[PDB]
Amino acid sequence: PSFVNPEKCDGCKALERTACEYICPNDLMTLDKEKMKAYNREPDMCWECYSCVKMCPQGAIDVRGYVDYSPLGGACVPMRGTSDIMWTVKYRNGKVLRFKFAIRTTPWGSIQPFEGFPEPTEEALKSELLAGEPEIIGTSEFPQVKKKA
Amino acid sequence: PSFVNPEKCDGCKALERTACEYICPNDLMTLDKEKMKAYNREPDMCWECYSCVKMCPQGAIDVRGYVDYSPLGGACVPMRGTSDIMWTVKYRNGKVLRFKFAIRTTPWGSIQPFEGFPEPTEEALKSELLAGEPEIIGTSEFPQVKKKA
Amino acid sequence: VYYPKKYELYKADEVPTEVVETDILIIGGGFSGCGAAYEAAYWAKLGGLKVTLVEKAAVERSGAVAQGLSAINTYIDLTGRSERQNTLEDYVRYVTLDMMGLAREDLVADYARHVDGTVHLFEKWGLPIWKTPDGKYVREGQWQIMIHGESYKPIIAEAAKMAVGEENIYERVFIFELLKDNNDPNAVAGAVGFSVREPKFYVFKAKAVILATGGATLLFRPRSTGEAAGRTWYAIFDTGSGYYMGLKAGAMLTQFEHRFIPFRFKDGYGPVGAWFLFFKCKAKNAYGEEYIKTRAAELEKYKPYGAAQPIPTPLRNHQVMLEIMDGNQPIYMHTEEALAELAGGDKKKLKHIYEEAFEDFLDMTVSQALLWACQNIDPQEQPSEAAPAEPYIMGSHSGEAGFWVCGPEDLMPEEYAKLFPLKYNRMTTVKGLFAIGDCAGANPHKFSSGSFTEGRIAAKAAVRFILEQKPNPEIDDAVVEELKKKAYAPMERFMQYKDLSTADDVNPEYILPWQGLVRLQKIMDEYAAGIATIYKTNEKMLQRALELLAFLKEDLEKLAARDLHELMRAWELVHRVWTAEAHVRHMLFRKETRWPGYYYRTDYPELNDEEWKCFVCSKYDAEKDEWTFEKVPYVQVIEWSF
Amino acid sequence: VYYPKKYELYKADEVPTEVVETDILIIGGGFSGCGAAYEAAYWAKLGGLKVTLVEKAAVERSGAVAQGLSAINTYIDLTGRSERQNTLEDYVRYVTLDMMGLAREDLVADYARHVDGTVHLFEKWGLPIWKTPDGKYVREGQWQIMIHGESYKPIIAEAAKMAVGEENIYERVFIFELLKDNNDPNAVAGAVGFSVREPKFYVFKAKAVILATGGATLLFRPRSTGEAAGRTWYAIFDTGSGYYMGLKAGAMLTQFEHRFIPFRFKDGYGPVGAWFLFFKCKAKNAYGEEYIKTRAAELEKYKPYGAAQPIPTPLRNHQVMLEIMDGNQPIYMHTEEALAELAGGDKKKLKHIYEEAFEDFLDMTVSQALLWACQNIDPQEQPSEAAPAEPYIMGSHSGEAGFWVCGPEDLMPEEYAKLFPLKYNRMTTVKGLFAIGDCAGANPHKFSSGSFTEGRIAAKAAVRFILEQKPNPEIDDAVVEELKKKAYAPMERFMQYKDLSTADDVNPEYILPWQGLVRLQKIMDEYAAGIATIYKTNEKMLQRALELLAFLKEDLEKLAARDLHELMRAWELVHRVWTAEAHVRHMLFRKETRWPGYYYRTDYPELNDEEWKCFVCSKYDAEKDEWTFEKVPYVQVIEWSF
Numbered sequence A, B: 001p002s003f004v005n006p007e008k009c010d011g012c013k014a015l016e017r018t019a020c021e022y023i024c025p026n027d028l029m030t031l032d033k034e035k036m037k038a039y040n041r042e043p044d045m046c047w048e049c050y051s052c053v054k055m056c057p058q059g060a061i062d063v064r065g066y067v068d069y070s071p072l073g074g075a076c077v078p079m080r081g082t083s084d085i086m087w088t089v090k091y092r093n094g095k096v097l098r099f100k101f102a103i104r105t106t107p108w109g110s111i112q113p114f115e116g117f118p119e120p121t122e123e124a125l126k127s128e129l130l131a132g133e134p135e136i137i138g139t140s141e142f143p144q145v146k147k148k149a
Numbered sequence C, D: 001v002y003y004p005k006k007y008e009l010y011k012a013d014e015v016p017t018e019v020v021e022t023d024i025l026i027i028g029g030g031f032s033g034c035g036a037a038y039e040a041a042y043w044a045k046l047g048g049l050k051v052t053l054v055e056k057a058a059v060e061r062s063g064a065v066a067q068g069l070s071a072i073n074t075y076i077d078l079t080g081r082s083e084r085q086n087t088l089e090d091y092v093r094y095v096t097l098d099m100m101g102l103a104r105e106d107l108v109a110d111y112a113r114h115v116d117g118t119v120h121l122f123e124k125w126g127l128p129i130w131k132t133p134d135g136k137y138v139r140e141g142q143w144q145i146m147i148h149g150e151s152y153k154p155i156i157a158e159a160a161k162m163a164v165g166e167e168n169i170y171e172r173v174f175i176f177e178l179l180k181d182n183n184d185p186n187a188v189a190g191a192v193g194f195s196v197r198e199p200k201f202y203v204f205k206a207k208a209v210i211l212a213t214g215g216a217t218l219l220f221r222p223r224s225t226g227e228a229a230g231r232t233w234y235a236i237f238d239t240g241s242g243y244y245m246g247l248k249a250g251a252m253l254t255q256f257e258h259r260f261i262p263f264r265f266k267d268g269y270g271p272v273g274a275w276f277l278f279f280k281c282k283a284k285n286a287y288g289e290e291y292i293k294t295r296a297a298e299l300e301k302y303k304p305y306g307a308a309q310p311i312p313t314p315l316r317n318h319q320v321m322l323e324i325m326d327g328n329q330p331i332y333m334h335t336e337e338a339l340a341e342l343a344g345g346d347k348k349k350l351k352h353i354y355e356e357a358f359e360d361f362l363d364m365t366v367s368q369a370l371l372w373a374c375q376n377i378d379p380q381e382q383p384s385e386a387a388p389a390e391p392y393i394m395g396s397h398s399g400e401a402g403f404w405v406c407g408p409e410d411l412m413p414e415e416y417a418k419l420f421p422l423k424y425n426r427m428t429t430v431k432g433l434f435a436i437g438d439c440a441g442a443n444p445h446k447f448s449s450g451s452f453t454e455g456r457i458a459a460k461a462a463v464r465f466i467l468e469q470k471p472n473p474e475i476d477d478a479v480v481e482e483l484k485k486k487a488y489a490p491m492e493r494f495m496q497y498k499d500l501s502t503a504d505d506v507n508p509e510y511i512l513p514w515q516g517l518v519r520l521q522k523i524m525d526e527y528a529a530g531i532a533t534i535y536k537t538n539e540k541m542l543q544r545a546l547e548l549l550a551f552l553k554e555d556l557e558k559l560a561a562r563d564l565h566e567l568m569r570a571w572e573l574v575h576r577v578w579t580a581e582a583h584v585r586h587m588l589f590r591k592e593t594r595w596p597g598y599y600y601r602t603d604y605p606e607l608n609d610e611e612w613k614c615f616v617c618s619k620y621d622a623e624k625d626e627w628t629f630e631k632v633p634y635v636q637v638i639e640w641s642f
């Protein structure tokens, strides 16, 4: 499960939103208004998806493997950029691995959903064709499938 | 597991010691010094032995069957006396059973550990005989057991 | 177990209601949902229709793809953009055989002829697809392609936000029940929910509703019950919400007995697809035997299924189960021998495949990489243990459980259109109510690309439905208020009975969400073919399950909640319990064992193509509280041969 | 899971030490302990010896008899006070056959020739024994008698208190380790512990130490993991403390592979003894089949064990296992048919036995009666499901795991005297250290009466040892100080690393007690023949368990505790881990399956009377951190024939 490092956490300074609390798919991250520091409210419901870890601008969140099967000492630390993401995997025995993978080939927020698509029409609404088809499929026509004789 | 009824618990503040805290075989019952009321500190470690329930002079403790397999509504309530104990078993559907069993045939605190036993002697210390033997066994002689030839 | 730091209680009457009127309402902003939002925004312009997307969390990372994915499991490739081209006929054949003969081929063939386009768009939007020096999509197996998918959801999420507009996306709003047309008992009119960030009750009025809540997990007790209870292979975020509200609405379910048991790396449940298909890794028992070899003969009884290529997934699982019962565990994924073989002495080549190996985990299930790190397991030196997890219920992966939905007019045979009042692609038996992704049953293997695709298909259909039928659903205000009271009842019950005990979680008049869940899991695990009985069950076990579920269902009326988070948890439980009951009733109804490896009816141990080569469809009537079952015979729609 | 209301932290250096000097130290105030205190108090007078009893809880209700018991399982009856008289030879035979041919007959006959006297005293002290109109003790089966035993422990507690004196009884003090003689590496010198009510470190200096801590429970994952994780059939209070400190001291263990799997009422784990022996209740599978009969053929291979009467307990379990493996559950205890048949139409007779039925549960395992009530189960109308629970490690019941202990001079053969430096009854291989009840191995079926009796035996032997050998060990203050530091280390570790995380129970530098226990339970359940694999295991699984236990043992050095309660939980965990390691190494050493029904080694499925009809004795050398094993051939000591 995830956990917040008090020394690095700043309850998300003056930003408009609390990154960890905003991103968690299971509503686990929340703010302790008293300490002004975040924490996982229900760790046994953590999927260890690392979403919070990646979105914490202070890098104040890490993941400690579930106690049921995880010996202490292991860690996976991500450093997500815009076109790639870096990972450092540290083994219980001190072994340290470093990787870097691409995550996007285009600028963030640059998607034009129907770029080049023709306008929809009432006639087309009645066909089997979806937006951009059959062009986006890459075929010379709408894919045909042989019906059982 | 066991749970304390706030309306009935007086924190044993009119007694020399806290009954539930004193009796629990797993050290689960303790006092919330704020409320001055008892509570099970670790319910999933409760064996449901009913010791606390039986020793609470205010009858403030009861047991709510483990949630894992217990549908709501059931209850077993004891009223322990000196020579016998009464039980009321209440079903989820409303059925109520009542029972009464003996628990002791002598007055409490009346045991004379070695009544009728002769004094121990150095000679007796080297035999196989325990205190009160061989007569407490019901035989005039120490029981013999055939050894294999 | 949940221990809230502080209370956050509200009584129903103190909670403000927010009414949202829209034309198309999409419940669930995951992959199928975003697919629906994207496509719907396109056709909606024709009628100036309003499209709304409601999500319980945040779309940017919500659902099964939160960590990303390492591959796109469904890409036919009809032109040759990848290392391997396929035909649609072979795909349909593949899916039906994998289902041991039961799949709605009209539905499968339909998403299959649309899926590639979706994949091409994903790449257009920024998804990095593994490519060969020649520029081809790198194949994993025959139907999948590798991807650098860490940001797979954020990217698809952006497409949806750009398409429908952020003002039409409601996040952190949990939908717990559908609303039906006051004017028509078999038509949808919207849905109700609440915010998990503030005291606010939502009433969504809509002409068309699309269920995209994902499947259901945590119905069964996992192999780890402590913190790792959260380490379910499938999305722990999906709790069968769609199944619950749709079935409560009267929409018929299909193949709900068809659960999916995933064989994955032990405990962390990392993926095995790449290891098996890409790295050519072998799985051997504790004695070094490659059981797919030693157990091949046992598949001979499942002709022609057992003689199909690839071998049906359930039959692969069956081979694993035989090893487990003979006590030949641990089962190992020999990654060390795979890497050496593949690298062939070339150290630089080894480094390259070694990075690819870890990316396969770091791109979709980090826990597995963390597990290796914590246990000092170096994939190039030692093998890893693999094992089948507890059952999960969904319709987009290898499982096909979900609502019985209508197919395209140009593919759906007369035999399959009978139960639909209106014939609109992906519409349920309930008018105006559509089901997609995990929610649409009888057409599995959609995965990421296929789920998004199905969402597109339903969205266009919803627009067509609206413009052609011109519905004007009226919600029943009397029912809405009832639902509002029910929504926060758990909080009001907590406040009313907490004083009965000095401990908040040990009360005789109520159960907390985590307490009801543990109970649900124990019941399903022990009676509905869970890990407890090595996925075995029988009529008696199942009947006892219904008895215990009935007790649990009644106790749901005594649920309590200490804050908004737990209130969601409460309803997530409610959703799971009904999904559980449906699954049990379906398993009890089908008297055969068609998918050994997923579950066994020891009282009906054989596969029966004489009497059960049919889809089992059911409907729940809330007014009568009665379940009705029906068998729809399977008919081959597409041309193909074993 | 544990969430302390508030901290209660102390550093070793700030905790005051209380030194207690005594001659005889008894660790554990349960049934065997109270028996040892009682008897010791009698003989101690010969030398004005001091006797000390230390109990972690309160003797009044501590241990396995906290709820009371519904019967006394061991009463020979040599004169006819019960409905059935028996002979000692018949009893010794009975036990050896039940243990599948392995039992220290010198120890078994020894306690059996003394036990009746203990029972008679129990009645003299106020224990209400069921009696017939003629005044005879009502028999349950052949060796047990029915008792109204709700206050069974309080009564035995009173006797022990009157005998030893309250000022010699230390309650709420947890013993976590033994102290050895500074000048003799194989002699005990005392023990160390701490209060769980205040900050106080105890140092007991003694000439003889008697291990009476009961067995070990919770090593394996139970059938219920939520709140019901607390519902173990055997005493959840016993966590193998004696096993740990004794083995750490170098005292040899025996038959530690011999666990005990009890067949009980499902979930509540109520007793089945009275139902089988007294009410003549039948157990049947889901199809009304009486498996003790339908599975009779499967026992024929065991000779002569399979033909013994009664059928050995493990083989009885084996028959149910076969039913479970075939998936014929639920298994039912037909109480309804048992009561009807016993009453014979007489309604008044029915009422009488109906009350007796409930007393059987209300007198020792209320949870079962509570389960019946919550599930609306009326024993006269419907049957109850039964199932085998998870493994437990103890030597007083049907299992014989414990310390290798010396027997009486007149019965112990030279073959069994070899490993003892001093031949005192019940003394371990470590001079001055005795073991009783669950702590003494190779002599099972002691139960309540037998354990108290074995305590009396060791107590007298202990007084004789002291007066004859005049022991005078000296503790090592350097070690004591190291142990004191270790004792509170968890609390100090918590304070030192808690600031690494905003959450107390999610820290990268430590594990809390409940966290380590969940892990231990998962390891044992999945690799040490737990419920997860239907009690099956093999060399590979066992070797992997040792590797995982090694990881866990290392992490024990990183345990954290937030209060005294959790500090004790911490050491209870430590105690379980080592106990579990011994169990695993013992099962790995024995290459046969002598107790099918308790566990199966799939790689050595047969019983081997040619090379394994021996006791497996091991020793752990702390200084070398090495385990050594040896086989002590069984020899029949008492005259009897099949």
Ligand SMILES: [C]C1=C([C])[C]=C2C(=[C]1)N([C][C]([O])[C]([O])[C]([O])[C]OP([O])(=O)OP([O])(=O)O[C][C]1O[C](N3[C]=NC4=C3N=[C]N=C4[N])[C]([O])[C]1[O])C1=NC(=O)[N]C(=O)C1=N2[S](=O)([O-])[O-]
Binding pocket: C027, C028, C029, C030, C031, C032, C033, C054, C055, C056, C057, C059, C062, C063, C064, C065, C069, C070, C071, C072, C073, C074, C173, C174, C175, C176, C212, C213, C214, C215, C233, C234, C235, C237, C238, C239, C241, C242, C271, C272, C273, C364, C365, C396, C397, C436, C437, C438, C439, C446, C447, C448, C449, C451
């Ligand atoms: C989990 C997982 C893993 C681990 C792996 C994998 C997978 C998974 N795959 C598959 C995919 O992902 C699928 O198919 C998809 O995603 C499906 O979709 P859907 O159906 O749509 O679902 P989701 O996404 O999950 O979503 C849902 C949503 O909804 C929501 N909700 C719920 N409930 C509710 C809501 N909202 C409001 N209200 C309520 N009540 C959630 O939250 C979300 O967001 C795959 N695929 C591909 O392609 N590839 C790969 O790789 C994969 N993986 S494997 O192969 O390995 O197996």
Ligand SMILES: [C]C1=C([C])[C]=C2C(=[C]1)N([C][C]([O])[C]([O])[C]([O])[C]OP([O])(=O)OP([O])(=O)O[C][C]1O[C](N3[C]=NC4=C3N=[C]N=C4[N])[C]([O])[C]1[O])C1=NC(=O)[N]C(=O)C1=N2[S](=O)([O-])[O-]
Binding pocket: D027, D028, D029, D030, D031, D032, D033, D054, D055, D056, D057, D059, D062, D063, D064, D065, D069, D070, D071, D072, D073, D074, D173, D174, D175, D176, D212, D213, D214, D215, D233, D234, D235, D237, D238, D239, D241, D242, D271, D272, D273, D364, D365, D396, D397, D436, D437, D438, D439, D446, D447, D448, D449, D451
């Ligand atoms: C549990 C149970 C039930 C439910 C039932 C039954 C039984 C049980 N049984 C049996 C008996 O009980 C036995 O055997 C006895 O008890 C044993 O003894 P011992 O070993 O001694 O013991 P216990 O008691 O448990 O005790 C112990 C003690 O110790 C302590 N600790 C621990 N740890 C520690 C301590 N202290 C200090 N430190 C440390 N560390 C505890 O706390 C206690 O006190 C039986 N029997 C007869 O007889 N009868 C009947 O009925 C019975 N039941 S059955 O039948 O079923 O079987």
Ligand code: SF4
Binding pocket: A004, A008, A009, A010, A011, A012, A013, A018, A019, A020, A021, A037, A038, A055, A056, A057, A058, A059, A060, A061
């Ligand atoms: S996102 Fe990071 S800095 Fe902001 S509240 Fe969460 S953990 Fe603290």
Ligand code: SF4
Binding pocket: A001, A002, A023, A024, A025, A026, A027, A028, A029, A040, A045, A046, A047, A048, A049, A050, A051, A052, A053
């Ligand atoms: S790892 Fe994922 S599931 Fe866990 S708290 Fe963070 S974001 Fe939520």
Ligand code: SF4
Binding pocket: B004, B008, B009, B010, B011, B012, B018, B019, B020, B021, B037, B038, B055, B056, B057, B058, B059, B060, B061
């Ligand atoms: S024994 Fe009863 S009155 Fe006394 S503290 Fe405990 S619960 Fe309260």
Ligand code: SF4
Binding pocket: B001, B002, B023, B024, B025, B026, B027, B028, B029, B040, B045, B046, B047, B048, B049, B050, B051, B052, B053
């Ligand atoms: S029922 Fe027994 S174990 Fe539970 S708290 Fe009360 S005394 Fe303690």
